[PDB]
Amino acid sequence: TLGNTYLTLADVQKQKDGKGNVTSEIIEMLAETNPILEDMVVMECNDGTGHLTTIRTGLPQATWRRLYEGVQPAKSTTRQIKDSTGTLEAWSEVDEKLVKLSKDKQQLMLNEAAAFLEGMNQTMASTLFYGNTATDAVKFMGLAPRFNAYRAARNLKPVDTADQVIDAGGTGSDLTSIWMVVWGDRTAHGLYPEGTSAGLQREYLGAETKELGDGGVYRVVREKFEWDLGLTVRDFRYVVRIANIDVSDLQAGTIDIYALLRKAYYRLENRVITGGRAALYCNADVTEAMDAAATPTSSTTASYVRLTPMQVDGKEVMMYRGIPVRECDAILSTETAVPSVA
């Protein structure tokens, strides 16, 4: 019924130049930048079951020792968490007749392979930032499904992740979310099962002999684009997620991003002490707002940042208190609400 897949002739026709040769100047309007996939630290599971982490969920209570009064011997209580690695795969397939009909065979495959690379990168970034294993069961535990509900009356640092998140008051559908993550061996990092390799494992099988249930056969050229990844947050205190930022009011000059950045830094009790490299993943609106607050103009109603006349334009913010602001495209401006929890 559908003409999906298989790189039908229409696209080949539109991949053809005015001279009739296959173009090598395919404009990439739907291209994204995702530094998260690059700066993230990964290693192997190196164990039979999933990645296991051990937590102290309770400390023994001390007593004041009334003299000649017995002391009860206490205990230490521990709780754990597991993890796993997801596996993505993209498979190209064409008809040898179709590629031979095109004037070149290298150019068509090059364009399709570039499209595959970009699509796989975008998918991996999307699942890393919003990948829920409760509703998929084949994906891997992302970051949005954690911190899924925030706490309003913030306690010091209870075991629920709800204390990490800051609510900015966003209610409608313009809600975005900043992310600070510390990447290190003990805190948070990527995973991939032993026996595979990190990054995209591109494969080129060559010509094949695709059959059909009917009985007919014909030649096909196929490619394999596979990537295995698993995200693990051993210490949840090592990740802080600002949430519910209304982009409309964010640009209007109501959600002052630096106060929320401070709050997210401080709810990042750890890392400040130590743990490993950290980051400030965010979308374009957030960096734009940081630039807006850093270089004030007829904006907001009051600010405390005077600007020499030679710098009234602004600069591109790169790092936040030493934390690099790795702006990423995976984060959307259409995130769901984050319900408040007592």
């Binding site: 009334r66 003299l67 000649y68 009064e69």
Partner: protein
């Protein structure tokens, strides 16, 4: 305050309604304490109080284990309702003179309060400030 069990009149005892100390000290024989080396004690209110008019924590002693021969070694007096606050040392800083075989603490409250507690006993070194 280095309190100690086996020498404590009462640990966190509630005061509401007329009653005596839960624990009654027993010194083996009717020999004396207050004499010689000072022995600090603190019959002190721990938790606040209520509509009760007053309180009369007295250090009663008697030769018998059960106190049928009352003898006031020292009395708190009729402390008013306002001063029934935490940290109020209701009796003498040191152990009075004339300790018999047994000693008790008697709490006589004018009326009954809905709140009030006392931890009374002998401490190693009465802590000021």
């Amino acid at each position: 305050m280095i309190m100690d069990k086996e020498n404590t009149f009462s640990y966190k005892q509630a005061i509401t309604g007329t009653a005596v100390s839960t624990n009654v000290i027993d010194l083996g024989v009717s020999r004396d304490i207050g004499k010689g080396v000072p022995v600090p004690i603190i019959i002190q209110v721990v938790e606040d109080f209520a509509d009760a008019t007053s309180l009369t924590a007295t250090l009663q002693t008697s030769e018998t284990e059960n106190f049928s021969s009352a003898t006031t070694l020292a009395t708190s007096g009729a402390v008013p309702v306002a001063d029934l606050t935490a940290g109020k040392q209701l009796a003498v800083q040191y152990m009075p003179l004339g300790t018999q075989r047994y000693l008790r603490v008697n709490y006589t409250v004018s009326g009954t309060a809905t709140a009030g507690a006392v931890t009374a006993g002998v401490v190693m070194s009465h802590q000021q400030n």
